[PDB]
Structure 1
Amino acid sequence: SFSLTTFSPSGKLVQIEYALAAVAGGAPSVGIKAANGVVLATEKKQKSILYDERSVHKVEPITKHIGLVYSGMGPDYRVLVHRARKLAQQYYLVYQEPIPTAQLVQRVASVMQEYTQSGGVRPFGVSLLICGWNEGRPYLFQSDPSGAYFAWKATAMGKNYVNGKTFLEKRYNEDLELEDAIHTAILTLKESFEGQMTEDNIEVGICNEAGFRRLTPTEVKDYLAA
């Protein structure tokens, strides 16, 4: 019942320092907010053909107009899934409306804070990247295990995330349609990913006026044609 996270002689937190170093080496994940939609393209890699791609999906929706991707530990993410979805539930219980992305990320990031204080528990090993659609304005947020959530037009997360950020810094600018947002998200994804690129290796999903929806492998292959 004693706190496992304490202040270092330099003032930093030692436990959350390794949490940020853990999500830095996770699966490469990128996202872009352009025009009326946000593109989420992640990496689902299977070690063998025996693996069924329809059983486990990395891109999961939080609700109709909100979706979320991740780079980091598998188990800690599903715990975030249940609590964040239950938070959206308890939201819709009280407020009977779709949840705004700013309020959703805020109280979920507070859960990450609780385990930097309460004892006998480790902090989360997952850095969440949240996508949302409210009042006609798209939302792209980035949260890490430290509990501090930011906002980005485009960013990168996972292995070699520094390159993905610099690439979008050069290539990406304003006035990009959702069609260009997908093709730009693929180009920055071609850099971080290595090897042959198929529709099963990448899991892509978008959020627009019609809400957050995941792309089927058929239309993904159409975008694999450049």
Structure 2
Amino acid sequence: GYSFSLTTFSPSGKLVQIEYALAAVAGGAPSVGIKAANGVVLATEKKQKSILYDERSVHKVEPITKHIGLVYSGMGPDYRVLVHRARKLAQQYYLVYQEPIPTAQLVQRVASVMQEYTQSGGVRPFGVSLLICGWNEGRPYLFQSDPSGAYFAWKATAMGKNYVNGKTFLEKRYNEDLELEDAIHTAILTLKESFEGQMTEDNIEVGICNEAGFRRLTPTEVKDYLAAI
């Protein structure tokens, strides 16, 4: 293996491989996260290239524990590695403290793992950005993590293709008094903007987090919500 760093400083002080990884991320499928008073909603677009594909073979929304969930934007193969490591870290924390890991601690550990690949020998940075949702101490959380290793706490956010317009949409139509169902309606509407084709229950994925835990909605419920809208 190569023992030298492949990421180095530019004469203007920029780390360029990180910029290229962000360029890779900005070309992925859209994702939306909204935090309400009762829980968090994550939505993503799941358009596929052909009808021969099995729509239920792989999922973008995945549970880390009983109360934490992930979505991503970027490259799928890197997302799988990150998901595996996040699950292992949560299990280690549980083994030590006999208590479920809080969201803000999992985000920190995952961010440190993502940063290790920027200052290590012979490897390239991850090309994915992550949205994490959780429920702790009777209140919800929503975090974002970048390929560089920096994380932020948001109320509503959009990522992927055409995310500036998504952020403007969320800014104009967000207030702190939303219930979870109004949040789901707003998330689906935000995904509707800049969508290609006619959307059904088979080409979007939704996940919710509240007091009972994290769960991904079944296609029947997505059909109900789409009919309502």
**Interval of TM-score (by shorter of Structure 1 and Structure 2):** over 0.9
The CA deviation string for residues 58-106 of structure 1, in whole angstroms up to 9 with x for no partner, is 1001111100000000111111011111111111111121110100000
**1: distance between equivalents of 2:105 and 2:143?**
11
**Are the equivalent residues in 2 in contact too, given 1:28–1:192 (CA < 8 A)?**
no
**Are the equivalent residues in 2 in contact too, given 1:36–1:138 (CA < 8 A)?**
yes
The CA deviation string for residues 157-183 of structure 1, in whole angstroms up to 9 with x for no partner, is 110011110001001111110010000
**2: distance between equivalents of 1:91 and 1:126?**
24
Runs ≥4 in structure 1, deviation > 6 angstroms?
none
Aligned-pair CA distance for 1:44: 1.0
SS in 2 for 1:223: helix
Aligned-pair CA distance for 1:199: 0.3
**Are the equivalent residues in 2 in contact too, given 1:28–1:193 (CA < 8 A)?**
no
Aligned-pair CA distance for 1:50: 1.3
Q: Percent of counterpart pairs with the same letter?
A: 100
SS in 1 for 2:166: helix
**Are the equivalent residues in 2 in contact too, given 1:155–1:168 (CA < 8 A)?**
yes
Structure 2 length as normaliser, TM-score? 0.97
- How many residue pairs were aligned? 226
Structure 1 length as normaliser, TM-score? 0.98
**2: distance between equivalents of 1:96 and 1:44?**
37
SS in 1 for 2:87: helix
Aligned to 2:31: 29
Aligned-pair CA distance for 1:192: 3.1
**Are the equivalent residues in 2 in contact too, given 1:129–1:141 (CA < 8 A)?**
yes
**2: distance between equivalents of 1:206 and 1:192?**
23
**1: distance between equivalents of 2:54 and 2:24?**
26
Q: Specify which of 66, 83, 86 is matched with residue 84 of structure 1.
A: 86
Q: Specify which of 152, 155, 168 is matched with residue 150 of structure 1.
A: 152
**1: distance between equivalents of 2:134 and 2:24?**
25
Aligned-pair CA distance for 1:49: 1.3
Aligned-pair CA distance for 1:51: 1.0
**1: distance between equivalents of 2:189 and 2:9?**
41
Specify every segment of 5 or more residues in structure 2 that has no aligned partner in the other structure, as ranges. Answer: none
Aligned-pair CA distance for 1:32: 0.3
Aligned to 1:16: 18
**2: distance between equivalents of 1:23 and 1:132?**
23
**2: distance between equivalents of 1:53 and 1:85?**
25
**Are the equivalent residues in 2 in contact too, given 1:42–1:69 (CA < 8 A)?**
yes
**2: distance between equivalents of 1:123 and 1:175?**
39
Aligned to 2:178: 176
Specify every segment of 5 or more residues in structure 1 that has no aligned partner in the other structure, as ranges. Answer: none
Aligned-pair CA distance for 1:52: 1.0
**2: distance between equivalents of 1:192 and 1:108?**
31
